[PDB]
């Protein structure tokens, strides 16, 4: 199951997705696998893993560079092998942006498929926030500046994705990475996350889904849109200003939970969210998708708050 | 006593200082004092203080901006009034640099002299470090990235000063400010610090001097050079990687202290200084001033460590 989808047409409220198996792979990305030295495993699911590695001569012929390599475990079946190749083709289709985990190369010959991406040295944003949660005015002001910056950067990364007609479908702090300079990068662990052991992914129908992050139109109609990604961004803002607390606290995903969300029930503001960031969340959680803001508009709104400093 | 001196000639190991009272003041800096609204006091000495204020229409005609205003207290005498004006003239002589507290304007008519500079919103680096001292691998790595950045930025600020033939004479973490984006800015509180109540300033001769930060040639010959500023930067590095501990721990400034420093005694490395930053400190503490590195060279050395990431 390819996670990032790419739309080609909107034929009056119905998306025409592009078959990722029909996207090109440009051999400019090809890199010899014997110039990768594999290190620790950074994440692993049932069928896939991401491993830290050193790449010799990937960018400059005389330099080594730390990278992340996505690969399948031997237990993987054909559909997982296709998905890895489709993720490779989507990533090269997207192109490069500062706030996404970028493609650096690939090994598609001489062994199983390897996908080489940037390595983010501080790990996932969710764990970063929860450490600061477990852990005076100047210190709090500086933390608020970081959180404003993270929301700005994720919003730019998502605006870049939407500009390439790409829908993320699993936006959440656990899928955002932090790296040098406090730069945040959107990624998808996809096959490299063990979702069977993550309570945030819930059984609904024939899938395990991050329901507390999903828009209502996605839960009752299984549709994923640019507007539903905006909804997820709103949920992301709530965990961001709550220091990584899980959304809808003390409320498990029952059938009771599903009722409330169609009743227009929303979360209240996190205690220390700035009013104008709370205002952005609420508009992301509009029951009407076409009343939610676009990521381009969210970028402008957050730019204005940061400039007021 | 003007703190920042400006040299004009080096006539074989003897400096010709420029009389700051002979530097021009350009009226382009003139700003009406009735467009300042004064707030809290940020620091105060015997004769002077620095106050936070809002300046209406200072940069853009339609915008307010937070600034810092240096001014004298009524107890000030003629020599302090001249010094404030000389500091104004040095600051406009220096020009603008990202890593110094820059001049934004001045009120030299219609009341006592006011000097308007950038406001740094996180205060002094020394208190910032001591809070982190009172206060796992990802968190420590990120702290080390900040400390590397602070040493790089202070070194660029000092290289800019040396390039303008300016000697600071009181470089220390207490004279470095932190502001938005974790930018550090060199300043001098000068008349706005109460040095009578600061143990770091010690009675030597007819002055109160920061002896633990001074080069030996400055202690026994009362000479201040570009090379003695480099010495102070080395001491600054030691407090930086020690999280604001006072230099030469458990050793008061006796006559015994003076003996040891001419004996070539130096501090050992802070426990978590990177080897290459320790190497920079040691070279800053060379008994021969002409064997110390220049700030231009320190900038290059630290740039290389940061690039290795
Ligand atoms: C020693 C302390 N730590 C702990 C944790 N720590 C990290 C780093 C990290 N870096 C990644 N870079 C790219 C990734 C990726 C690429 C493509 N698709 C999906 C994911 S994951 N990821 C994790 C989960 N933990 C690093 C150091
Ligand atoms: C509410 C919590 N705090 C605590 C402390 N805090 C600050 C800010 C600050 N900002 C400065 N900007 C320029 C300065 C200057 C200009 C010219 N010459 C010398 C100095 S001092 N300075 C201090 C000492 N504390 C700010 C907020």
From Swiss-Prot, chains A, B:
Residues 15-17 are annotated as: Important for interaction with phosphotyrosine-binding proteins. Changing residue 201 to F: No decrease in activity. Leads to autophosphorylation at Tyr-278. It comes from the Eukaryota. ATP binds at residues 43-50, 70, 118-124, 174. One of its GO terms (cellular component) is plasma membrane. The modification Phosphotyrosine is found at residues 15, 17, 201, 278. Residues 36-309 form the Protein kinase domain. Keywords: ATP-binding, Cell membrane, Cytoplasm, Disease variant, Disulfide bond, Glycoprotein, Immunoglobulin domain, Kinase, Magnesium, Membrane, Metal-binding, Nucleotide-binding, Phosphoprotein, Proto-oncogene, Receptor, Repeat, Signal, Transferase, Transmembrane, Transmembrane helix, Tyrosine-protein kinase, Ubl conjugation. One of its GO terms (molecular function) is protease binding. Changing residue 200 to K: In a germ cell tumor of the testis; somatic mutation. Induction: Up-regulated by cis-retinoic acid in neuroblastoma cell lines. The active site is at residue 170. Changing residue 217 to K: In MASTC; sporadic case; somatic mutation; dominant negative mutation; loss of autophosphorylation. The modification Phosphoserine is found at residues 199, 269. Monomer in the absence of bound KITLG/SCF. Homodimer in the presence of bound KITLG/SCF, forming a heterotetramer with two KITLG/SCF molecules. Interacts (via phosphorylated tyrosine residues) with the adapter proteins GRB2 and GRB7 (via SH2 domain), and SH2B2/APS. Interacts (via C-terminus) with MPDZ (via the tenth PDZ domain). Interacts (via phosphorylated tyrosine residues) with PIK3R1 and PIK3 catalytic subunit. Interacts (via phosphorylated tyrosine) with CRK (isoform Crk-II), FYN, SHC1 and MATK/CHK (via SH2 domain). Interacts with LYN and FES/FPS. It is linked to Piebald trait: Autosomal dominant genetic developmental abnormality of pigmentation characterized by congenital patches of white skin and hair that lack melanocytes. Gastrointestinal stromal tumor: Common mesenchymal neoplasms arising in the gastrointestinal tract, most often in the stomach. They are histologically, immunohistochemically, and genetically different from typical leiomyomas, leiomyosarcomas, and schwannomas. Most GISTs are composed of a fairly uniform population of spindle-shaped cells. Some tumors are dominated by epithelioid cells or contain a mixture of spindle and epithelioid morphologies. Primary GISTs in the gastrointestinal tract commonly metastasize in the omentum and mesenteries, often as multiple nodules. Tyrosine-protein kinase that acts as a cell-surface receptor for the cytokine KITLG/SCF and plays an essential role in the regulation of cell survival and proliferation, hematopoiesis, stem cell maintenance, gametogenesis, mast cell development, migration and function, and in melanogenesis. In response to KITLG/SCF binding, KIT can activate several signaling pathways. Phosphorylates PIK3R1, PLCG1, SH2B2/APS and CBL. Activates the AKT1 signaling pathway by phosphorylation of PIK3R1, the regulatory subunit of phosphatidylinositol 3-kinase. Belongs to the protein kinase superfamily. Tyr protein kinase family. CSF-1/PDGF receptor subfamily. This is Mast/stem cell growth factor receptor Kit. The lineage of its organism: Eukaryota, Metazoa, Chordata, Craniata, Vertebrata. The gene is KIT. The chain holds residues 554 to 931 of 976 of the full protein.
């Amino acid at each position: 199951e390819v996670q990032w989808k790419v739309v080609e047409e909107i034929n009056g409220n119905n998306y025409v997705y592009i078959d990722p198996t029909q996207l090109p792979y440009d051999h400019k990305w090809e890199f010899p696998r014997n110039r990768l030295s594999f290190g620790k495993t950074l994440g692993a699911g049932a069928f896939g893993k991401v491993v830290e590695a050193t790449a010799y001569g990937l960018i400059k012929s005389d330099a080594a560079m730390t990278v992340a390599v996505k690969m399948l475990k031997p237990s993987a079946h054909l559909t997982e092998r296709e998905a890895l190749m489709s993720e490779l083709k989507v990533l090269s289709y997207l192109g490069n942006h500062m706030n996404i985990v970028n493609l650096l190369g690939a090994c598609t010959i001489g062994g199983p498929t390897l996908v080489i991406t940037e390595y983010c040295c501080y790990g996932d944003l969710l764990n970063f926030l929860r450490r600061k949660r477990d852990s005076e005015d100047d210190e709090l002001a500086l933390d608020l500046e970081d959180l404003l910056s993270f929301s700005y950067q994720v919003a730019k990364g998502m605006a870049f994705l939407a500009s390439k007609n790409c829908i993320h479908r699993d936006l959440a702090a656990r899928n955002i990475l932090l790296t040098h300079g406090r730069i945040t990068k959107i990624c998808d662990f996809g096959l490299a996350r063990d979702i069977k052991n993550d309570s945030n992914y819930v059984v609904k129908g024939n899938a395990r889904l991050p329901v507390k992050w999903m828009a209502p139109e996605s839960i009752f109609n299984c549709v994923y849109t640019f507007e539903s990604d905006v909804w997820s961004y709103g949920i992301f803002l709530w965990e961001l200003f709550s220091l990584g607390s899980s959304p809808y606290p003390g409320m498990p995903v029952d059938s009771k939970f599903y009722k409330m969300i169609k009743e227009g029930f929303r979360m209240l503001s996190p205690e220390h969210a700035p009013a104008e960031m709370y205002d952005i969340m609420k508009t992301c959680w509009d029951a009407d998708p076409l009343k939610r803001p676009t990521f381009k508009q969210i970028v402008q709104l957050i730019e204005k708050q940061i400039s007021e400093s």
